[PDB]
RNA sequence: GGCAUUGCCGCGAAGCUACCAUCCGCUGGAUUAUGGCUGAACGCCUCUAAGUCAGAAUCCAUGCUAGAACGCGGUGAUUUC
């Protein structure tokens, strides 16, 4: 159809500056400093009154316009990782052998390590991604958590640790022993 | 010692040679299917549309062979009459 403009609004809290030169986004908030290349997309930014900024498509197709709301989506998951952060809390399954999952240094890399996945002698490494924090959760049995300002990077390091225990040859309906992602939020609570 | 078209027999070094003998046969990246992340389209959802992770005896490299006889480089010496 080429809808001849489309826009969307991204909502900047106090703390938080955002600076876009051509698509290169820097936002800067309490928790640290994010950057995205949007060169890919074709989108027009314009900041409106330093809490608002709105991107738009002229002259775009449906896919175009798609693409609009996914760039307000990911500069707002900017905004949300350096005001509240992301936290991801993963649980151990598991129906006879427990998993144990700890943290390693292989020349200061920090990977996680994982033991007895369904009695393997096999050790899963996964690495911790840059800005990607790790914590085992007291008071809640087999959870890990990670941390971070972008949930890309603590949602695909999430992701990692769920992938490195796939469960081979086996009726996966039956062995459902794996490390899955139990809770997807935001570090500070309540907000 | 000759001849017997290598006269025949045993052993027989060298050379050649046998899974009949011994040795040796490399590790990186990009991918497929697929499983995922974020994520709209479609206020939800969604591996997919933008972006993106992993991943096959695959592919391209590393490695190995040849070296273009009209591809190239470096370097030595270049004729007293
Ligand atoms: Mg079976
Ligand atoms: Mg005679
Ligand atoms: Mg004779
Ligand atoms: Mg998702
Ligand atoms: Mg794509
Ligand atoms: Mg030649």
């Known amino acids: 159809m080429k809808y001849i403009q489309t826009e969307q609004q991204i909502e900047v809290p106090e703390g938080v500056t955002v600076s876009i030169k051509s698509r290169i986004v820097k936002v800067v908030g309490p928790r640290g400093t994010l950057t995205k290349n949007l060169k890919h997309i074709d989108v027009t930014f314009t900041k409106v009154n330093n809490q608002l900024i709105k991107v738009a498509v002229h002259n775009g197709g449906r896919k175009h316009v798609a693409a609009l709301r996914t760039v307000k989506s990911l500069v707002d998951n900017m905004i949300t990782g350096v005001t509240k952060g992301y936290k991801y809390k993963m649980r151990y399954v598991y129906a006879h052998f427990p998993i144990n999952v700890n943290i390693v240094e292989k020349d200061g890399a920090k990977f996680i390590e ?69 809770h997807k939020g935001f570090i500070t609570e309540d907000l």
């Open 114 to 182: 994982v033991r007895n996945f369904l009695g393997d002698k096999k050790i899963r490494n996964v690495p911790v991604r840059d800005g990607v924090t790790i914590e085992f959760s007291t008071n809640v049995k087999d959870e890990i958590v990670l941390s971070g300002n972008s949930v890309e990077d603590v949602s695909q390091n999430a992701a990692d640790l769920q992938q490195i225990c796939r469960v081979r040859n086996k009726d996966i309906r039956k062995f459902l022993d794996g490390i899955y992602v139990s």
